[PDB]
Backbone:
């Protein structure tokens, strides 16, 4: 899996314009929909228990985010997840805040036990707190082997590992940490890619790589204006990034282990 | 504040009359109360403020009735609807109708799921609507059909005739109609398809105009045209930059577009019918 | 007692400690608030569920309650979280958005005051007056701070801030903030940010509002005649860009004799 494969997956997301159903936090709804529209995908947000199962089945991908979770909303995520698995719709989870409060940790787990997930995307602390029922390259694998899915731990360096493989990504910019939704949007981007790419691990890597190179390009363009401009430039790049920009910038390293 | 800026007795709703309505909106700065989806809250409010109106969001049943009666226009949006929201939307719709406040509906997603479809229909049965804005499919599921897939008149006008309201089906070409009149607008830019809320914001702008224009057909036409021109103006400064810059520019133009810009750029076409 | 040089000193403190500001606010300003705080140098977090508000607040640096789009459930949650804050010495800030415009907002605002010890209350003259009751702006702020034994920050053209025995007048910011939704909500949260590192609440409010106002000014010059949209973005950049220096320079703080 390299730069060439990634770039090609980006073109397929644009060619099919995957409908991504997100049940996420109200701090990133607008950013997320705008990011997906820019990428070339079709976003849709639905949270009511009277329709999440109906919306998930006609979708290309379902993404769950607990950022500002509620009891009834968590209830809806699982309902939607079950409807999704029943129809072959890839499900991606973003364990926002897992470990911060007991409720988020419980909820993350709850969803993982009730929904066949295609991938989980979060920071190291969140993956660890979620998976740490008792007593990050090695963290990814163990988590991916245990939960049996694609574990994507993003940060200065991205660590994506699946049942038997491990990859590290080297793109993006530190400015991404100053924009709320950077992760929520990314997680949703991952869903858009899993919708057109049969291999989850490959979808994650491509989605994250495309996202990163887009962020670098926005970064240089943003010069030193600030967080506001960068945010705006990211939405622009997700649209202007080309299959080529990915090919010559994407840094994908297949980790050799045991 | 709701007067009339054009009458068919003077001819077809035109470009100058629409320019008139824009100044009127900015003169009175109507308080536009919208019970909308949480994907477009911030953008809606910023767009309305840029235009010159007064945005306000209130969803609680404990207050919607009160907020609606002192509003210039009420706008209902089911983008991320819930049972509570719909009940609220109807509570407020009724109170708005009871106080003569024009109510605008944006059937976001009608058709995608039967829940959105039923809710949109529940609102229409319970609330008198001044206008309804949405795309071709949403409009079709809201009013009736079966075999989805002649909108530039037929659908728009027949929809208006059944629900006795104003039907505005936006798109590359816009079809606005009431029980016996229909128009087509040719303003805007393709980049509005890349901004979330572009339509929810527009339905809101429709509310503001309805608050200053007695005739909803006219208010709707003036609203969409001013919105489209601003869009056009916005795309020019930022077409090579991307959706992000466009989004921001659109907000900039909604405040700097003048009635001059609207009178000279607006392209409104009266459709011969019946 | 408090001046520009000290104000700027606080801005540095915020960025140094990057306090966790817990906001239970309206869904019209959530994305703007988190981005604004991030650019400033604070760490925002939003949590509304009663199954976690007490837990999130006790681990925060400051709690802010904004009733912009209030519901019965969120108001009860704001109180539950308020009390938890009180018990852990976490400053609480209240933004009575719309108080006086609707009876429910008025009562929800008063109910919160009755149950939660607050460090400050930020809002426009009308909201403060309808909330606290009737006894210019300087007299109003002073009487209010005295009755509720808290800090009253009535922003606007000229900012009037006062605790039970002191009153200050601020003269920064720019008119365009009037055209950006959430300008007040982000400010309140900014206030919470300053309260998280400045022991005296009155000094905190002043420092927060001055910094915010200077940033607003700078963004407006760079914005000029472009529009509300470009301003909103520039404001985000400036909350990141503005320096201790800029505050010491532009900050215009004035103590009133009464
Ligand atoms: N310091 C950094 N330098 C370069 N790229 C980064 C950095 N931090 C994150 N990224 C990248 O930013 C994107 C943002 O995802 P990120 O892991 O920050 O989200 P998150 O869910 O908000 O987490 P966190 O709470 O830790 O901010 C990814 O493409 C990631 O590789
Ligand atoms: N292809 C286009 N070319 C020019 N203007 C357009 C185009 N599509 C929409 N507009 C304009 O954009 C505005 C946006 O309304 P639109 O019909 O896209 O909203 P919507 O509710 O988001 O629908 P949709 O889901 O189909 O994106 C109107 O002013 C309309 O005339
Ligand atoms: N006319 C003005 N000129 C300059 N600065 C202003 C003006 N009005 C407000 N500000 C500043 O704007 C910031 C915004 O707070 P503001 O009082 O407008 O918020 P609000 O909660 O939205 O209230 P309101 O509903 O009355 O608009 C503060 O820094 C304040 O000093
Ligand atoms: C600030 C904040 N508080 C609760 S969710 C949230 C946003 C989630 O953001 P991100 O995708 O960056 O993790
Ligand atoms: C992405 C999304 N999901 C539910 S509502 C919504 C926004 C509605 O947007 P628009 O006004 O463009 O039709
Ligand atoms: C338009 C609107 N409607 C309900 S809350 C809200 C935003 C409140 O904003 P601000 O902090 O500027 O007062
Ligand atoms: Mg982050
Ligand atoms: Mg995250
Ligand atoms: Mg659209
Ligand atoms: Mg729409
Ligand atoms: Mg306010
Ligand atoms: Mg304001």
Residues:
């Amino acid at each position: 899996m390299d730069a060439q494969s990634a770039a090609k997956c980006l073109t397929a997301v644009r060619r099919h314009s995957p409908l991504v159903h997100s049940i996420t936090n109200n701090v990133v709804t607008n950013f997320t929909a705008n990011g997906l529209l820019a990428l070339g995908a079709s976003p849709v947000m639905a949270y009511a228990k009277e329709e999440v199962a109906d919306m998930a089945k006609i979708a290309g991908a379902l993404v769950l985010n607990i950022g500002t979770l509620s009891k009834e909303s968590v209830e809806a995520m699982i309902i939607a997840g079950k409807s999704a698995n029943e129809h072959g719709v890839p499900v991606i989870l973003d364990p926002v805040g897992a470990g911060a409060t007991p409720f988020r940790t419980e909820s993350a787990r709850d969803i993982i036990r009730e929904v066949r997930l295609a991938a989980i995307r979060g920071n190291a602390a969140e993956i660890a707190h979620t998976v740490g029922v008792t007593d990050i390259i090695r963290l990814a694998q163990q988590a991916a082997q245990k939960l049996n899915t694609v574990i994507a731990i993003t940060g200065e360096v991205d660590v994506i590992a699946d049942t038997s493989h491990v990859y590290t990504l080297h793109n993006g910019h530190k400015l991404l940490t100053k924009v709320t939704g950077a992760g929520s949007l990314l997680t949703s981007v991952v869903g858009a890619f899993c919708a057109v790419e049969e291999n989850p691990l490959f979808a994650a890597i491509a989605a994250i790589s495309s996202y990163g190179v887009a962020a670098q390009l926005a970064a240089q363009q943003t010069a030193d204006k600030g967080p506001g401009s960068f945010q705006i430039e990211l939405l622009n790049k997700l649209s202007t990034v080309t299959e080529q920009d990915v090919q010559e910038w994407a840094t994908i390293e297949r980790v050799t282990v045991s």
